[PDB]
């Protein structure tokens, strides 16, 4: 109870892009995750570290929600402890990461007949990023050895590019909204529990 703000992140009209995901903090309220677990709107829900029925009994101090939108094939790919193309440049999962992702299809919610979309993600980067790190700089990446004096074009390729989703696209290209819930425990009294 206590008016837990779970109706502001999971179900909202607009979500931020994957490269700049929306970060929210939940604490100081008691919630019942049984209703959320028994929902058919979620495409998949499975992870480690806690049982679905044990969520109410265990008490956690902080909850961090990271909401974004990814492709259909990227939902299965993202997982802790594995190296991937999208996981090495935009979102990295720690080995001891507590929590997991929830993905749902929103093709009807977000679809256009044709054109470029406002969502951006990076294809090239200098190196791997630290886990749970957000990058906002959109500077060009010097792919070629020879410098171009910072001029857009060859050997100074722009990393960010759009999705281009289509309603007629395959199941792997469907727009999937993903929210990552992470449970954080610190040297503070627990604030989130169950009834």
């Amino acid at each position: 109870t206590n008016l837990c703000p779970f109706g502001e992140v999971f179900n909202a009209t607009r979500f931020a892009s994957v490269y700049a995901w929306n970060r929210k903090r939940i604490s100081n309220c008691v919630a019942d995750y049984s209703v959320l677990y028994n929902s058919a709107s979620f495409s998949t829900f499975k992870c480690y570290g806690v049982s679905p029925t044990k969520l109410n009994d265990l008490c956690f101090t902080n909850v961090y929600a990271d909401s974004f939108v990814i492709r259909g094939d990227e939902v299965r790919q993202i997982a802790p402890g594995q190296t991937g193309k999208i996981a090495d440049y935009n979102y990295k999962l720690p080995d001891d990461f507590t929590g997991c992702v929830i993905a749902w299809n929103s093709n009807n919610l977000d679809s256009k007949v044709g054109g470029n979309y406002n969502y951006l993600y990076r294809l090239f980067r200098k190196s791997n990023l630290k886990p749970f790190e957000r990058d906002i700089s959109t500077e060009i990446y010097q792919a070629g050895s020879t410098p171009c004096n910072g001029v857009e074009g060859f050997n100074c390729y722009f990393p960010l590019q759009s999705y281009g989703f289509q309603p007629t696209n395959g199941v792997g290209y469907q727009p999937y909204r993903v929210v990552v819930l992470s449970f954080e425990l610190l040297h503070a009294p627990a604030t989130v529990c169950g009834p």
Partner: nanobody, 129 residues
Framework: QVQLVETGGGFVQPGGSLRLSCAASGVTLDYYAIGWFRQAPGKEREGVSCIGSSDGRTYYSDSVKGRFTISRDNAKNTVYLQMNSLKPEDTAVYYC??????????????????????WGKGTQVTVSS
């Protein structure tokens, strides 16, 4: 159901003129970047040129030497490339591929990289003395 076809294969002594035509069918994207990639047996893959369909700006390497002329027929949705001054190192199979554009802060930028979504059956060009 995007389909790509490449035509214009020809064999002739160095110093002639060559023409390549890329035709795309079933394209559901209003704006896209169309690029030519050449590959030869025994050497890796590298891009030579690619153009955007928003107004027609082009991105090219240092080996163009100004001899590559690229035109975009919007009515037929065709890419026509003409070149002269045949170079022995340019003999390879050419593939034309289109990728989705990039929108950022009201500006149009095209990402023209190695990774590609679609592919088509390119054409072989071999020139030797």
């Amino acid at each position: 159901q995007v389909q790509l076809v490449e035509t214009g294969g020809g064999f002739v002594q160095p110093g002639g003129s060559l023409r390549l035509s890329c035709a795309a069918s079933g394209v559901t994207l209003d704006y896209y970047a169309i690029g030519w990639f050449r590959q030869a047996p025994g050497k890796e893959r590298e891009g030579v040129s690619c153009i955007g369909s928003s107004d027609g700006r082009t991105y090219y390497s240092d080996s163009v030497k100004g001899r590559f002329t690229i035109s975009r027929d919007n009515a037929k949705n065709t890419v026509y490339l003409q070149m002269n001054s045949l170079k022995p190192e340019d003999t390879a199979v050419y593939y034309c591929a289109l990728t989705v554009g990039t929108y950022y802060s009201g500006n149009y930028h095209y990402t023209c990289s190695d990774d590609m979504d679609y592919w088509g059956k390119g054409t072989q060009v071999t020139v030797s003395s």
